[PDB]
Amino acid sequence: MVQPSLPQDDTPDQQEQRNRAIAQQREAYQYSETAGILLIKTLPQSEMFSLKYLIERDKGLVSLIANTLASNIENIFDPFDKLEDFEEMFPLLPKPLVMNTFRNDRVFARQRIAGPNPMVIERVVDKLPDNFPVTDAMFQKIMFTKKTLAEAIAQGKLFITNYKGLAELSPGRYEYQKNGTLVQKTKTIAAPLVLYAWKPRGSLAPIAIQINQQPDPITNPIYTPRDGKHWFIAKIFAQMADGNCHEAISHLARTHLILEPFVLATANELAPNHPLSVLLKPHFQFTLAINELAREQLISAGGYADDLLAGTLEASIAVIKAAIKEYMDNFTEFALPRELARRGVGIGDVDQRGENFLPDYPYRDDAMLLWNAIEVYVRDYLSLYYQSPVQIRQDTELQNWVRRLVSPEGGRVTGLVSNGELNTIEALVAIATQVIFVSGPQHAAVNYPQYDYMAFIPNMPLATYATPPNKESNISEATILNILPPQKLAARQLELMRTLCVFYPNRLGYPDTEFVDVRAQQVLHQFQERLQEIEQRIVLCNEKRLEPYTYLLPSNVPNSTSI
Amino acid sequence: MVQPSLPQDDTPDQQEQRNRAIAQQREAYQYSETAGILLIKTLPQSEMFSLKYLIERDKGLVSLIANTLASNIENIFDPFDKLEDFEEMFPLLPKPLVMNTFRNDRVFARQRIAGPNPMVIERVVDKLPDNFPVTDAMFQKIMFTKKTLAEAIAQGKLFITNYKGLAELSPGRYEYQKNGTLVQKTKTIAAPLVLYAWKPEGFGDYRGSLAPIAIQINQQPDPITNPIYTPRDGKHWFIAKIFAQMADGNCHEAISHLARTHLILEPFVLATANELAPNHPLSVLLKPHFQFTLAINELAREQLISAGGYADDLLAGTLEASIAVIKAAIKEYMDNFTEFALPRELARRGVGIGDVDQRGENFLPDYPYRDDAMLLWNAIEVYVRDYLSLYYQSPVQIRQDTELQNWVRRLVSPEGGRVTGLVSNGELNTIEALVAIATQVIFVSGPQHAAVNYPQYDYMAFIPNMPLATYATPPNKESNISEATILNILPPQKLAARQLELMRTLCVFYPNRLGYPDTEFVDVRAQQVLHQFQERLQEIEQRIVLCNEKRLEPYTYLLPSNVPNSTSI
């Protein structure tokens, strides 16, 4: 056990040992790339999943074998015979929480603030997009009000999800053997705009849905809750969009994959007894390995992204890389408070009374608790070792860490640092706070609702398989079943979500090995106590909330992105 | 990294470093036990499965999800509706090779010499067991001959599989909910005796084959409740074969597979870690053949011999009974370790290469496991001798190797494996004794485990050929047998599904390959020895390919390209 220390404070012998360890780690953690995504060349055996991990994962897969044995779903590309069949896919699995109430407009809307992807909704200011021609008459008919759109917008009552980021997807293709002939079909993509309003007990309510980006009163009209089944179908497409942005942007890109350069830089530039390495590595546990499983089984040819998502694998990969690049180029701007403020849903986005324009936002409140607790944690921890900015500046290993991260072949994190150089303790506190928050809380918030909201296929199908029907046509059960995924791909989606949610590989603030520094043990203990308080506070709030939001309870938050 | 060296040949500083490494290894490889079975306390991360291994295993399990999705089998304890339903369990999996011909008496018999458990059959000497009252009239009726039992025995024509090792099994219990009430049922135990005869004339072709003569389903004879069945008994003979196959499968998994490959290897891995320096030549020789062994044995503890695991669900006895059988097999093996070397093990069953008639030909000429396994044993023996002779020239080096002597003492000790049959005179004193030991360990880890592990899918994933348990009593010899009778004897749908699941996972890929370690020997002489071993393995592969061109059916499980480097699945 070696006391952590800054390299400039070590002896020449100690410094040479640090440099030898760094050389060996650079040999073991080499940089590689898959379709432009930075990954590791060869996973070190020390970075593999543990035996315990493998036992839990295997338990999940075997449970899926049993559940499939007890299920009546078939290995065919036909639709389900009945919509009710979707509720019979879980004979030996937990029932997804959204299953009973997914048709409800409020349950649809609340997934924007407490579902798997609570990262899209933004407050409308000035006007709606010109390609989203919602009219005063529509708004007044829906809200049963005399208020106009401009008055609602001026009051901060209107919110929007604009899935334009999917407009350029090449639709995915699928094929299968039927009666000795190969059948080839194409998925139907959509990039909807969804208008919500805060209705003051107060609830977020869906107002309008335009399924595609370019308006037309006949072929791409604005649907409202007054359009019955058509409205229902509209929501499906909206949900599909929210799913594709969830997996490509919010889950894979902006947790799993943007963490890879930080793990690799930590190995490539920080000695084992560097305080920042000691701080961060518990929050990298199994991250490289789970990202190798993402390479092998998710974003590979024939994998889950190919099978399930709306676009071709190439299109999905394009979306992922764009999300990564925007995150890295503006790293500091994706800190939780700034990210919330940029969408107009931060804690400072209040009306004249001081009340938030979006008062019900469980992800925001709980994630803010976790963010501030983490910030105090890394500030005190780093204060144990950095007292003057000169120690930051003269830490050659830390400087090489930054330089590796912003370099084009080390992650290209051009938004990581100001003035081209890391110079202050507080900037490092922000960096480490954001890394730890992403690895634990954020990944928990986007990963673990996947089963409750996405293993029940009709609530959030990862692709749609037929075009939106004409606004005047009659909608039968067969129409909806033809839009929803066929049996085999619904099975594959349940398979995926169950594997991604089966267990918690670790726990936030509880590393496998204690800190060597007793002072660091104290700071970590304080972090654990604060997590206890946060757990109690969230339990209280969940007593108050319309529905409990459990995904950011500290006991449900892993220490690292690891599943 | 370091050139391999004996510890007494090192400087005091180098010896200090060896002792430090051994101390840390002792801290990381601690001894533990589950139900009296020696295992590791906590697996070091360096001993975990690799990422590639996990990817392959996950491919297996997901493929099982897909095959289950495409199948019509249900999650119920009801029997199948039709026997043909057992042929429908593989819509997205390879068809087990035995499936189409499992009813044939010669296919049943040849699994004694080329199936998953080619380890039970022995040549009958002097007489049959007194509790197995086969008569001259039965033998003459089935063989269509005037020859007597005594004459056939004197000619070495008769062989037997006696499953008395299962006679004390407590039958396993199972239960389930049907119409809102709990149904509790018990499996049926059998410990059969099976009499075979070698037919040189065969079927009129210039070939020979074992043929089944008689089956007594249980050990204590009775003309009414435990009679001797023969091929003349129609459906009753088919059922008798089902019970004999169930017994052979239980002995296979408990004795031949789990006990005498996986579990007897654990003390050698642990002793290598606990007593041998990283640069010790014996450790460098043995560790490639231990890759993933501790890990897969932790999976065996967790998912096989655990409560609710595969052994609890599928095997004939209770989990406690199966564990008793496993531990008895382990103890006999360790007590007579040298006597379980392949040539000696074959000789003790009267089916060794020296078991020949007056014409020089073997009493059991058709024994693919023996032929190919002998090739691999001899090749490994040459490899081990030539490797060890690079480091041990005179026996004094053996005796003065403190680490090797500690390795032996650890192995023979009650807490380190109880391998009381490992050495003579209480001490390892000669080079050739270490050659025999290392040869046997490598043979077990690679070839033997291959021979008992990889036929599991071809012969045991088709349930009716070898069900791991039977679920009804053998019908009375005079009773009429319907399809529902046989379906009630065969496993219910859920447990048949579980058996397919298991066999598929156990046979889905090769974690490594015999003679191809992940990292080369630093000693160029040792690497040359290894290269010669690889060329010998290619020669053996071609020889086996020719033999298979001449055999009744190919025997592929001991092709060196199909033999892993370690027991690892």
Ligand SMILES: [Cl-]
């Ligand atoms: Cl023992």
Ligand SMILES: [Mn+2]
């Ligand atoms: Mn994840």
Ligand SMILES: [Mn+2]
């Ligand atoms: Mn095995």
